[PDB]
């Protein structure tokens, strides 16, 4: 029932806040100290993402079982694209929080973290290279929430996904882009979603392996989301 402009306005109004990390962490970062900070932040952001999902146009109209499945398949993709977004204006650094600015060197303290760090930094640089706008970013996040789990449960989600495609095209058209530029930029944004899906897969295995080393604290919601992929 919403036009393209109403959809962008609704998505921007429902944006979750940027949370803070601990203000006096262990000065020499350890694998346990670093994993505890990232997991504590992820567990606090999950409550915010659950409420952000309910305000995504068309998400409430799904069954309660369908809402759980979509959030279980895309929660890490959503947390990652949010980190990539706020890290755009900080080359070589990932802004996990305004008081947590880490580079690839600081990621060496956690086993198997540097490749995930490099992949996140590479997405942030590409977002910088394409001059991604906040209106385009909120559309991509809504697409991730609806698309990541559609092929694991269908008709209603495809219709909402088509409207977000119309919305993204309307944004580029109102930005003065030609029609050829419109499908070219739309394809470049949607191809990045394949890399974000790949990053969440690699990050899911890393969190699972860190739980075997007993590094993940007892964050019940985060463990519940991670348990959905075991």
């Amino acid at each position: 029932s919403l036009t393209a402009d109403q959809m962008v306005s609704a998505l921007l109004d429902a944006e979750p806040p940027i949370l803070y990390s601990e203000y006096d962490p262990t000065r020499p970062f350890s694998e346990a100290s670093m994993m505890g900070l990232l997991t504590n932040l992820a567990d606090r952001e999950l409550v915010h993402m659950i409420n952000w999902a309910k305000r995504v146009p068309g998400f409430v109209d799904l069954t309660l079982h369908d809402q759980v499945h979509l959030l279980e398949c895309a929660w890490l993709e959503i947390l990652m694209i949010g980190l990539v977004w706020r890290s755009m204006e900080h080359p070589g650094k990932l802004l996990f929080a305004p008081n947590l600015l880490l580079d690839r060197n600081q990621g060496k303290c956690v086993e198997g973290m540097v490749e995930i760090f490099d992949m996140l930094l590479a997405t942030s640089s590409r977002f910088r290279m394409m001059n991604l706008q906040g209106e385009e970013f909120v559309c991509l996040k809504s697409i991730i929430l609806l698309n990541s789990g559609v092929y694991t449960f269908k008709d209603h989600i495809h219709r909402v996904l088509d409207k977000i495609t119309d919305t993204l095209i309307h944004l580029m058209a109102k930005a003065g882009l030609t029609l050829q530029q419109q499908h070219q930029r739309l394809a470049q944004l949607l191809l990045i979603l394949s890399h974000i899906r790949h990053m969440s897969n690699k990050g899911m295995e890393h969190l699972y392996s860190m739980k075997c080393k007993n590094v993940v604290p007892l964050y019940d919601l985060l463990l519940e989301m991670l348990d959905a992929h075991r």
Binding site: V47, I50, K54, L64, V68, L71, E72, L221, E224
Partner: peptide, 10 residues
């Protein structure tokens, strides 16, 4: 279970 409760929350 937790995600289940937080979704039907007010």
């Amino acid at each position: 279970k937790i995600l289940h409760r937080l979704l039907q929350d007010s």
